[PDB]
Design a protein around this ligand. Structure first.
Ligand SMILES: C[S@@+](CC[C@H](N)C(=O)[O-])C[C@H]1O[C@@H](n2cnc3c(N)ncnc32)[C@H](O)[C@@H]1O
Ligand SMILES: [Zn+2]
Ligand SMILES: [Zn+2]
Length: 218
């Protein structure tokens, strides 16, 4: 019955220490442009998509027809609701059905180096009953304890319907939430923290309720 955790809402990532630069030359896929405004360009066949790179809109042969610029264009689903999830504080659920592979929302926050987060863990996060952090890349981490978006309220499940994917978006790695399977309306979005989130030494009881639930968060 406790109120939701305060944070400052952001529209894009905040780079505190480092930049999550990827070593990429995005963008010379061998995609063919289709003809109808409603036959999308670059499908999974796309060579940028294959290596989780988004096309650039300046160089993509499909132009304004390419459907592989979801993160940079912020093509988030507009049907999320934060809600009281039993035994798991607050969570996020979709209000409309989603489909496997569908991009849902970007995970936002303060991008910090591994060590900066560790310091933060001792000076400020030692009395916390909730943990808001994803691994990004090479010792870098997206911290949403303070600044973030509604993706910070997404809970863990040992049998998840969603996953975090790391994409290079015009040279920078960003993390988005994507559907793993079809999900109907009202469904609580979940991903596996073990794989995606940063480990804390402090264990919490898992309540995901899967038959092979690990019993532990982390
Ligand atoms: C990223 S926050 C998610 C939002 C959080 N439920 C809240 O009320 O702000 C992660 C925290 O939520 C709780 N949590 C997430 N998944 C859980 C689960 N499967 N079982 C029990 N608690 C969970 C834990 O307290 C964890 O530290
Ligand atoms: Zn493209
Ligand atoms: Zn579990």
């Amino acid at each position: 019955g406790a109120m939701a955790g305060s944070y400052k809402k952001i529209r894009s990532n905040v780079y505190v220490d480092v930049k999550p630069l990827s070593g990429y030359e995005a963008t010379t896929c061998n995609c063919k442009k289709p003809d109808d405004d409603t036959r999308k360009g670059c499908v999974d066949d796309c060579l940028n998509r294959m290596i989780f790179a988004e096309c650039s809109p300046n160089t993509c042969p499909c132009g304004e027809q390419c459907c592989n610029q979801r993160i940079q264009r912020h093509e988030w689903v507009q049907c999320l609701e934060r809600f009281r999830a039993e035994e798991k504080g607050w969570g996020i659920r979709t209000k409309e059905p989603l489909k496997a592979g569908q991009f849902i929302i970007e995970y936002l926050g303060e991008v910090v180096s591994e060590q900066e987060f560790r310091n933060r863990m001792i000076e400020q996060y030692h009395n916390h009953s909730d943990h808001y952090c994803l691994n990004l890349d090479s010792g870098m981490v997206i911290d949403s304890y303070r600044m973030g978006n509604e993706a910070r309220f997404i809970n863990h499940s040992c049998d998840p319907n969603c996953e975090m994917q790391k994409w290079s978006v015009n040279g920078v790695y960003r993390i988005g939430l994507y559907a793993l399977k079809d999900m109907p309306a009202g469904t609580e979005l979940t991903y596996d923290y073990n794989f995606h989130s940063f480990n804390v030494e402090k264990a919490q009881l898992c309540k995901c309720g899967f038959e092979k639930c690990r019993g532990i968060i982390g």
